[PDB]
Amino acid sequence: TLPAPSVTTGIVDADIHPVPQDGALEPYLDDRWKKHIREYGVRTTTGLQFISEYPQMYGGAMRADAWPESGYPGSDRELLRTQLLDKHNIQLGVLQCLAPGGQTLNPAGQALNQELAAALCRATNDWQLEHLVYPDPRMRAAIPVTFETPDYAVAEIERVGADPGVVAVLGTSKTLEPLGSRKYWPIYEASVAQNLPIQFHLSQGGGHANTGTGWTSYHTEYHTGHVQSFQSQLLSLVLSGTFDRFPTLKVMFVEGNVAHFAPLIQRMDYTWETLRGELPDLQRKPSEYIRDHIWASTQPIDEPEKPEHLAELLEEFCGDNVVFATDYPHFDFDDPETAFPRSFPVDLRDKILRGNGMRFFGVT
Amino acid sequence: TLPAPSVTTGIVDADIHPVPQDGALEPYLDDRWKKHIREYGVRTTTGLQFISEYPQMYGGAMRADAWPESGYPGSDRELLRTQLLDKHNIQLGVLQCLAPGGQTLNPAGQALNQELAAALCRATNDWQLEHLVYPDPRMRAAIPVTFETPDYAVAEIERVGADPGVVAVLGTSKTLEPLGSRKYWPIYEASVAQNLPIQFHLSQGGGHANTGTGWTSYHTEYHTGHVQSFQSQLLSLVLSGTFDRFPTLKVMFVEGNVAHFAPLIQRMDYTWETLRGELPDLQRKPSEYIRDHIWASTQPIDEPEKPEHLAELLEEFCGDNVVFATDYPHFDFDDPETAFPRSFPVDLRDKILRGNGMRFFGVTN
Amino acid sequence: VPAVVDCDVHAVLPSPHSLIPYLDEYWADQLVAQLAPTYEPNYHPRGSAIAQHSDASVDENGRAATTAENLVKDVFADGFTDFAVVNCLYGVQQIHQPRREMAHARALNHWIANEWLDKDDRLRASIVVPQGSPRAAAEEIDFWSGDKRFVQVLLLGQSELLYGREINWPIWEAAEAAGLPVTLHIGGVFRQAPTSVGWPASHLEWYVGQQSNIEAQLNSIISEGILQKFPKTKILLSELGFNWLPPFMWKFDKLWKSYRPDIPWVQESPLELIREHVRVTTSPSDGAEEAGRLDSIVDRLGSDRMLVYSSDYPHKHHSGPRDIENGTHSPELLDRIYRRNAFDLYNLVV
Amino acid sequence: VPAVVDCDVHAVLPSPHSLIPYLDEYWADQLVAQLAPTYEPNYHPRGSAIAQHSDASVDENGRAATTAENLVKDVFADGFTDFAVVNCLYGVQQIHQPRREMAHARALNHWIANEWLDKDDRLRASIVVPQGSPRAAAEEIDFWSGDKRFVQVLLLGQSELLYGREINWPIWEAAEAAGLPVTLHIGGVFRQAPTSVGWPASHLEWYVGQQSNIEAQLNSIISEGILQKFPKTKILLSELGFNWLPPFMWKFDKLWKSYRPDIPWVQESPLELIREHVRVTTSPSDGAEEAGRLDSIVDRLGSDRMLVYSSDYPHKHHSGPRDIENGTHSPELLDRIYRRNAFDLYNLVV
Ligand SMILES: [Fe+3]
Ligand SMILES: [Fe+3]
Ligand SMILES: [Fe+3]
Ligand SMILES: [Fe+3]
Ligand SMILES: [Fe+3]
Ligand SMILES: [Fe+3]
């Protein structure tokens, strides 16, 4: 009986990062998993006990003002309500929790123990609805699920997926197979059956090196390199015909940037002209799927040298499928009043801040 | 209706490599795939059009005397009848077709195009059934399926898996996830329903480097390294509780050697004694799964400096679960008459040639 | 006057036997005992629509560009091209046995000179190098440094380790000190997945996607400091498109501004560094050959010194070796693309 | 008289802050800026049963082996041990940024020297090296060559490329130049899946499984020619078991016979090369402590020279450091293991 999300004068924020407070998941966890995590932590695709393979540089990559009186940035419900939800008149802000907090900062779903992973995803979903979305229904939940055990993720989608406080299904940008692979179609089927779209957020981990040709060294390399994963996942989700099988499926590439998709998509078509006959069951020209199936968030906003270049390239992607995100509380946080260049078209700015997001999330 | 196999005076050979003659698979191939093969070949986990990342060193790694008048070793079924089946009194020759053409190791279920791969898997299974198993049912089929796409695999086990010319499901030793992963449980479920066991043969590819710590350089590294894939699979299949879930599933590791398993399992038990707490749903002690679930084939037989160590290690692994293979027509082919050391006891050799394989493949007398 | 260079055309080795007159007795007996397995790659599958255009002089098997006579015939038939740079993609880099990798890369470059460079003096070639051992790659650059018909060093787009890693520095060292630019051509050793999220299931997926690895290789080369340790280095992107460069450059510049104290030695922007050091061939054009698009892509790069002409003979792309003119209104641009930029690479005159 | 040496015990770095006194201001400031992310490995998860046995001295936080006083109070209490080789497994080798890897590897060793070696002359240690840059790895080995309390080079069982690659030959060269044995310890850089068939789903499956990767390092070391190019090389397997060795040795020998001309420089059997150049620590014993199994495995190795005693302090194993006596009835064997075999590695007299 919670109401559907209503965006009128306010804006849509597609990427918000809450963190559970120390101990706060333990009400939704079996005793065996509390024991497990005390004894072993949340093992993942590293050899490190407490950190990921590229730990963040300058203060954990948090903006230095978002630290509360007790917890990590994102862990205080009141500071997030004031420093974010009111301050920018966000009427729909989508929680994307990528850490169960405490001593572990990797996404739940990427725990190498997948049974632990599904319990962590479940406790996270129960915690973010009871602690944030329901007391402050401006926030809604993108549910983390175990994309590398589809059985467990279908089960979770079917357990909380119809909850009005749920607007999306949260995955990660890196995976063991390209997301266009049949392994993940059951999760799409179970998503669609709840008329839910799916957000893939920037991540490390996954199983392979962070580029297709080696492990990066320097932080410019790691952070810039994040967009390669997204470039790789589009080509597979499109050229696999995932969207033929699932024609009501909405996927958004969250924090992969936007501009680079356009000459990628363009190169896909040009290549596909000559070699289309390798994949004859592909029903449409590759670029044709974008407007129906592929969204992106703005943050971190592209910054071309000629600002006129920006809106040119967002339109070459698809102007109706770019949606605004703060990425609160991270350091490269984008602001709704200051993100776009001074010369930015104003109709495009309003439907990113509003229109396109309402479409992606089924707002009417 | 083809009769069940019967072993009496002869032996089981759990690993024989027949090859389709050129174009022999096309009668069973939808025409869209015959064209895809002309244009792109079979794209796998290489950047190479025709070979795998480690091509054979000397004369195709084949026996020098096993070449027909025309074609690849294993391509002429007459030569295979006289040179192998007749010559060694083989009464159950389990076929494991490793490539769709005149190549040594280029497995079909490993095509990156998994619609292509399930196609060649189905074609291969129709071709070896009509062309070898039914003309001479001393041979039977281990049927390749696409383990990396469990939907197409459960369907191929369903299509042909009940055929009496079929004794086992055929997999590869290397895979993208370790075989105890839930990903592959749908295949184990479909195999239990057809009363079939599973053989995992030595492979390249799979999606990772060929060791867990880099690609090998010289051939001694590549061929000795095959054993490592099998160590890692056994650990995943046992500790994941895969056999808790499917307590009648039988798997054979084929051409992974045998003796190395014994200390592996011993290290597995010993570590678990301290660290069992991490996996408290596992129902049995790790080594207790071996007797009912883990089998191995003998070729290329272990050759310790002191021969009496062979039987020691085979009993430590599990003397009931070792099964003879020749690996015909590969160059390290094992001869039943000469593979066992001079002091080898006869009760154990007779199990390995006969009873052991009979019970794994559901054969009676 | 600067000469019109075709910056990317391909010799196609017919079969491993073609190397036998260029190997020791050991390596040639071994190659025949081994039944001559072929390391022909799958970068352009021989039977697919990109492998060769229809208007190609094929040989007795139906294969374009297995001889110097078949390529010279086609490439220079319209008198427009003065020189061609030959890149043989025969996959010696995927030979894991490193001794055989050296021996087959050496013998490949011998075949290229004797039967292509000695045949037509309008032909230049790159040195193929065995990148499995950087010090062995270095020694083969130096072995071919006396013969100036070799005008660049060939490296595959996908490597074992990123080209900026200290492990790989002896390749830029030897390249700088022999005068040669290094080209990255589409292709790879395939010792990890071609993408960071797994293996591409189709050749098309793989072919389109290899751009991602080139952002990674440039960010590696720049961030690790190759442009400051070997400041004369020039990097040619042969056949990887080029439209993706601007949005990658913009992010790499933005984050350099924050992260700069992590890489203090890079004191000029990556924006400038890429304009001054990186050239990209034009085939494929990836749709910059549509109306006004070549001007747009040159404007987004912020330079017109980068694009260098190539046909990609004999590969068939959706648009042809000169339909790029349909993209621009400047005869100055096309003059730069057609011959002036490539003077910076090779210094070849009419 | 050869000394009884504990060939593998462990120091545990409290936190990265413990590195602050041994870091240049450039890195001390930046570490504190980074809120000091800790590279504590998951090789022995600190809360699992293997991390420490209940008889081990602990600090205020309940952690064993974080000070020289606690370890020395525990290891030498009974008077049986004369020397212990400390290995600090803090995960500097998993730092991707190559310059911070080096600096932290150096501070760590400096930590080891001041807070441990200087505090008790019965302690020796390994040299932690940055394996991301073989050049830096060898320079690190030269720098500690001066201090002879450092008695071996520490490498992890899982590396980025196999240790036998040419790329990695500087480390072998620097180790031989200093007369230092090279040890592989369980642990890894995790720059690929820990197995050739992907990622283990638990630490237990990982921990049992790392023997396979040592088969590959030993095959690569021997196959690529390390023991002929650096014939004084000694290799000690540390805390990787040993019962897996014979079947690996026999198969490797059998295949060497089959492939001699592929590796012509290998003129001795890998059976003989391994018995001569490979030593193995005895903790964990993995079932060789049961009746007669220690005689049986030495029979299977073909050598009584390979096993050297360790306790693996402070880890907990199913059997104790001296329980290996239940597997033998040879006083002379227990003498090679406790005393004489380790003399070949460290030449330490009591
Ligand atoms: Fe974010
Ligand atoms: Fe962020
Ligand atoms: Fe075989
Ligand atoms: Fe074989
Ligand atoms: Fe080209
Ligand atoms: Fe240890």
Author numbering:
A (entry chain D): 11 to 374
B (entry chain B): 11 to 375
C (entry chain C), D (entry chain A): 29 to 378
Quote the paper.
Here we report that the 2-aminoisobutyric acid hydroxylase from Rhodococcus wratislaviensis, AibH1H2, requires manganese to functionalize a strong, aliphatic C–H bond (BDE = 100 kcal/mol). Structural and spectroscopic studies of this enzyme reveal a redox-active, heterobimetallic manganese–iron active site at the locus of O2 activation and substrate coordination. Metabolism of 2-aminoisobutyric acid (AIB) in Rhodococcus wratislaviensis proceeds via the initial, selective hydroxylation of the pro-(R) methyl group by the monooxygenase AibH1H2 to furnish α-methyl-d-serine (d-MeSer). Previously, recombinant expression of AibH1H2 in Escherichia coli enabled its structural characterization and revealed distinct mono- and dinuclear metal binding sites housed within the AibH1 and AibH2 protein subunits, respectively.
